[model samples]
Target: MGRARDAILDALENLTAEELKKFKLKLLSVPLREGYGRIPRGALLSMDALDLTDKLVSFYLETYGAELTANVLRDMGLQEMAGQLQAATHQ
Candidate 1:
């Protein structure tokens, strides 16, 4: 993974279980592409969810836009990730 991805995962890893659950709920509420439907299953651990969300963020940014992805992250209680994405947008 790239440094930004690693940073995102690290930020995700720091989330509490309740925080993660809320995050997952927010992410699932978004309408994603077909293949993305199975991502971040409820059964997943934090690491797995992190990986899934990382991939989702990457794909979403590429297919949609950084602004949307950052909004998603912020809505999911991932302000750190959103900030990182916002910073990346200026680069």
Candidate 2:
């Protein structure tokens, strides 16, 4: 793995800004991939289900996007609460 890291580092000798953005997007999207973890049985029962939308939205806003500031997170939380409640009831 260390050797491959060196090779990967070498491959990025002179990536442009666009290339960097692609790399960032790829890294961020990886955790959202399927088969990375067991999907909860509740997922099929409720499409809006999520374990921690607060942490997720905070991560996106604080680290990645400026569109979702503190206020936006509050509003998003309100919407997610409805879905969460519905899932909780079904479960």
Candidate 3:
């Protein structure tokens, strides 16, 4: 019922609208593979966990995965959550 996407939601759910943008920008700071494009500005407006997770699953699974998400969490000063994610687990 919960895993990497859940951890990502945990990392982002507390962020305010402006902070979500910072999160988005922080995530994008890493190089994206050619086929994947940027996250749409409109997509973040809802702030629902499902929306965030859905968006995350797309590029995250194929590319970024847990380590990058954890790095972004730490980059945003969310080390507590980052540690949880950094711990390896079953998918």
Candidate 4:
């Protein structure tokens, strides 16, 4: 529940149902470094914005952190949020 988490929440706020499907797919592709394996499909179905936000943070802590998320956002046609995250995180 820090800056990166809230940044991701704002990004998810505007997506449609179908759009989030696209989101989940890219999200899962990120390597979870801890060897935790795939994040479940049903998890996405049941999760709310903040609930899923938790997973993003989890993905981050596992490694790759926020930049991986920002890159994934860009792939999902979320260049605006991607830009926000990139700028917020700074290179």
After superposition on all C-alphas, the RMSD of every candidate to the true structure, in Å, is 4.2, 19.4, 3.5, 3.0
Q: Top lDDT: which candidate number?
A: 4
Instruction: Rank the candidate models, highest lDDT first.
Output: 4, 3, 1, 2
lDDT tens digits, residues 3-70, model 1? 44544455556667787676566666776656443345464444454665466556654334445556
Runs in model 1 deviating more than 4 A are 33-40, 43-50, 53-69, 77-81, 88-91
- Tens digit per residue, CA lDDT, model 4, 1-91: 5667766676677677887888777766544456544566677767866777777678545224456667777877678778887665553
Measured by TM-score, the strongest candidate is: 4
For candidate 1, the TM-score is 0.54
**86 in model 1: Cα distance from truth in Å?**
3.8
Q: Give lDDT: candidate 3, residue 36.
A: 52
Q: What is the lDDT of residue 13 in candidate 3?
A: 71
- Per-residue lDDT of candidate 2, residues 50-81 (tens digit): 22233333334222221222222223333442
Worst window of 10 by summed lDDT in candidate 3 = 40-49
Runs in model 2 deviating more than 4 A are: 32-91
Per candidate, the number of residue pairs that clash is: 0, 0, 0, 0
- What lDDT does the true structure give each of the candidates? 0.58, 0.30, 0.62, 0.68
